[PDB]
């Protein structure tokens, strides 16, 4: 989906890169290989410091829940 | 290769420096060219070099010194060079395993030195891989 586009449109692929690019560095998971190919499964790999850096970034992120007022911070990511 | 000195060293040393030095270099040189393409940068794979302390220590071992000598010169690159996301050296020791001149170990231990079963080197090589460790290689 827009894989024609983004081969095209000069203006257009400074936007997949800009996009990628920041997930590939913060979530260590490209797009581009996403679209063009959707992989069945998608394991992310945590390796030295990048990769901790990453999975630090995976850790994060919390999913809050009302309870009673309460803004209960509680873990997106339970396995990790 | 054994009985092997200086004047000796020739074809079958020249070939058992390629098995040991020149191409376990490519294959680290060659899992690189893999880890890169895909664009793997998170999953570094720790190299286990086999070394040793018998550098011409030992008497004509053949030319099995300079091929595992010339692998601790593998840090003077993990820092230097552009693969360090992509593996992790980890050297090892070679020590003194008994199997593969075995009738005198029994004869050194009495220095006050261990010597070890196949098994039990296996032990600690295996220990190298301890999740512990893992990270320790994975920042030097």
């Known amino acids: 989906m827009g894989m024609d586009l983004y081969k095209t449109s000069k203006a257009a692929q400074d936007v997949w890169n800009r996009a990628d690019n920041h997930f590939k560095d913060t979530y260590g998971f490209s797009i581009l290989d996403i679209v063009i190919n959707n992989p069945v499964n998608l394991t992310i790999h945590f390796g030295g410091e990048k990769g901790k850096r990453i999975r630090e970034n995976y850790s994060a992120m919390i999913f809050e829940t009302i309870v009673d007022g309460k803004l209960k911070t509680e873990k997106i990511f339970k396995e990790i | ?140």
């Not at chain 2, 420096?17 to 393409?37: D, E, F, P, W, Y």
């Not at chain 2, 793997?40 to 071992?61: C, K, W, Y």
């Not at chain 2, 020590?95 to 030195?113: H, L």
């Not at chain 2, 080197?121 to 190298?128: S, V």
């Open chain 2, 1 to 140: 290769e054994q009985g092997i000195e200086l004047e000796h060293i020739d074809s079958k040393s020249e070939f058992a420096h390629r098995i040991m030095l020149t191409n376990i270099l490519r294959m680290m040189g060659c899992v690189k060219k893999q880890k890169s393409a895909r664009g793997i940068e998170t999953r570094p794979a720790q190299v286990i070099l086999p070394m040793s302390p018998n550098h011409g220590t030992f008497g004509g071992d053949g030319m099995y010194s300079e091929s595992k000598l010339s692998l601790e010169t593998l840090f003077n690159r993990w820092h230097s060079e552009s693969w360090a996301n992509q593996l992790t050296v980890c050297g090892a020791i070679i020590g003194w395993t008994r199997g593969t001149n075995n009738i005198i170990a029994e004869g050194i231990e009495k220095m006050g030195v261990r010597t070890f079963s196949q098994k039990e080197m296996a032990f600690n090589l295996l220990g190298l891989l301890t999740p512990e460790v893992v990270e320790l290689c994975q920042k030097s």
